[PDB]
């Protein structure tokens, strides 16, 4: 049972993909982002407590989130609890082959960008190209890269550091095709300066990060194997301990699929629990499921999944939304469905999803 299920983006031409969701705690509202085949679009929605429904407003293009002559992709939003400022990180790639690419097929021409808002996402700043400052000399060592997709992370450390999940196709071989590896971008000063963390295992792509109780950053990545890949860091994402396979979280080979993970206050030793969404079919992108980890980020502690939606489902993004009407944690989930013909918003509580916990 759920509180709300609504298609917030629809296109028979598969125009909308790559969902990103952001919850604003003071406003008690959601920002739902998506790529529109390319620019980034957004729908704002307030949680109407009296009816316990999110009232989605009209779709609008995030005009500022783009570079002239470039396609924008991978919306990666974050709310800075210290300043209240919102960050929308995104990727920008030339719409057409550049002269440089004409001579160097694998030349990196991808840009890391951001737009910020100081009015709860109503208006955005001019885009800021973070590429050189965040990646540095390693830039030429990759063919391309991306952040997210989906929400990023803000730690509960003294600095309230920003952690942006990412992955890059490394041109390690001149003949072999570039292989992707996940990593994190880290800032302790609200995005003024950035550090590029070390890569986790090879062949890891779209990943998301969460912080759990010392405090560690857990990175959960898409793989080309039959299970998810996870790794934890004790230094805010700069370095990760050996990557591990999470057999309890299935990945459909050979392509795998993007999934989402968030932490939330334990509803009961550990301070936080993790909630994760991803398709549950052994080899198809179908049957979106929600999984719980009560002793994060231990791979063997993941629960069996509960079905959130049957049928075709792909990428998703989660956000905790405070406390639900029944008294248990409230969650919002944005996911691709029906052969990429729509992006659906699902709102449910922990009690609804995992009744055994109550
Ligand atoms: Cl919150
Ligand atoms: Cl807010």
UniProtKB/Swiss-Prot annotation:
The molecule here is called Sialidase-2
Q: Which GO terms describe its biological process?
A: ganglioside catabolic process; glycoprotein catabolic process; glycosphingolipid catabolic process; oligosaccharide catabolic process
Expression sites (tissue/organ): Expressed in skeletal muscle, fetal liver and embryonic carcinoma cell line NT2-D1.
Q: Which residues bind substrate?
A: 17, 37, 167, 169, 206, 222, 285
Asked whether the keyword GTP-binding is assigned, the reply is: no
The lineage is: Eukaryota, Metazoa, Chordata, Craniata, Vertebrata
UniProt keywords (A-Z) are: Carbohydrate metabolism, Cytoplasm, Glycosidase, Hydrolase, Lipid degradation, Lipid metabolism, Repeat
UniProt record similarity statement: Belongs to the glycosyl hydrolase 33 family.
Q: Where is the signal peptide?
A: none
What is the pH dependence?
Optimum pH is 5.6.
The protein's organism comes out as Homo sapiens (Human)
Report the EC code(s) recorded for this entry: 3.2.1.18
Briefly state the protein's biological role.
Exo-alpha-sialidase that catalyzes the hydrolytic cleavage of the terminal sialic acid (N-acetylneuraminic acid, Neu5Ac) of a glycan moiety in the catabolism of glycolipids, glycoproteins and oligosacharides. Recognizes sialyl linkage positions of the glycan moiety as well as the supramolecular organization of the sialoglycoconjugate. Displays preference for alpha-(2->3)-sialylated GD1a and GT1B gangliosides over alpha-(2->8)-sialylated GD1b, in both monomeric forms and micelles. Hydrolyzes monomeric GM1 ganglioside, but has no activity toward the miscellar form.
Query: Could you tell me what reaction this enzyme catalyses?
Result: Hydrolysis of alpha-(2->3)-, alpha-(2->6)-, alpha-(2->8)- glycosidic linkages of terminal sialic acid residues in oligosaccharides, glycoproteins, glycolipids, colominic acid and synthetic substrates; a ganglioside GD1a + H2O = a ganglioside GM1 + N-acetylneuraminate; a ganglioside GM1 + H2O = a ganglioside GA1 + N-acetylneuraminate; a ganglioside GT1b + H2O = a ganglioside GD1b + N-acetylneuraminate
The Swiss-Prot or TrEMBL record annotates one GO molecular function as: exo-alpha-sialidase activity
What InterPro entries does the record point to? Sialidase, Sialidase_fam, Sialidase_sf
> What positions does UniProt annotate as the active site of this protein?
315, 336
Where on this chain is FRIP motif (motif)?
A: 16-19
Q: Where in the cell is it found?
A: Cytoplasm, Cytosol
An example Gene Ontology CC term for this record? membrane
What's a Pfam family this protein contains? BNR_2
* Origin: domain of life: Eukaryota
Q: Does the keyword Repeat apply?
A: yes
BNR repeats span 115-126, 185-196
């Amino acid at each position: 049972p759920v509180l709300q299920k609504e298609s917030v983006f629809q296109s028979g031409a598969h125009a909308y993909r790559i969902p990103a969701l952001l919850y604003l705690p003071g406003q008690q509202s959601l920002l739902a982002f998506a790529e529109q085949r390319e620019l980034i679009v957004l729908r704002r929605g307030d949680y109407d407590a009296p009816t316990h429904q999110v009232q989605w407003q009209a779709q609008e293009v995030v005009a500022q989130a783009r570079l002239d002559g470039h396609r924008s992709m991978n919306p990666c939003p974050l709310y800075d609890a210290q300043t209240g400022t919102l960050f929308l990180f995104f990727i920008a790639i030339p719409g057409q082959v550049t002269e440089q690419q004409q001579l160097e097929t694998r030349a990196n021409v991808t840009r890391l960008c951001q737009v910020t808002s100081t009015d709860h996402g109503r208006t955005w700043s001019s885009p800021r190209d973070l590429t050189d400052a965040a990646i540095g000399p390693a830039y030429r060592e990759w063919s391309t890269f991306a952040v997210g997709p989906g929400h990023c992370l803000q730690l509960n450390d003294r600095a309230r550091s920003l952690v942006v999940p990412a992955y890059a196709y490394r041109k390690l071989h001149p003949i072999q095709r570039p292989i992707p590896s996940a990593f994190c971008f880290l800032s302790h000063d609200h995005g003024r300066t950035w550090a590029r963390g070390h890569f986790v295992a090879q062949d890891t792509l779209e990943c998301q990060v969460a912080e759990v109780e010392q405090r560690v950053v857990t990175l959960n990545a898409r793989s080309h194997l039959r299970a998810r890949v996870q790794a934890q860091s004790t230094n805010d994402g700069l370095d990760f301990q050996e990557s591990q396979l999470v057999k309890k979280l299935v990945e459909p080979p050979p392509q795998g699929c993007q999934g989402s993970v968030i932490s939330f206050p334990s509803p009961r030793s550990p301070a936080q629990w993790l909630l994760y969404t991803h398709p549950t079919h052994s080899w198809q992108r179908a049957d979106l499921g929600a999984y719980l980890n009560p002793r994060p980020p231990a791979p063997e502690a993941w629960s069996e999944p509960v079905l959130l939606a049957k049928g075709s489902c792909a990428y998703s993004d989660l956000q905790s939304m405070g406390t639900g009407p029944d008294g248990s944690p409230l969650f919002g989930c944005l996911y691709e469905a029906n052969d990429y013909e729509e992006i659906v918003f699902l709102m449910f509580t922990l009690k609804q999803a995992f009744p055994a916990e109550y």
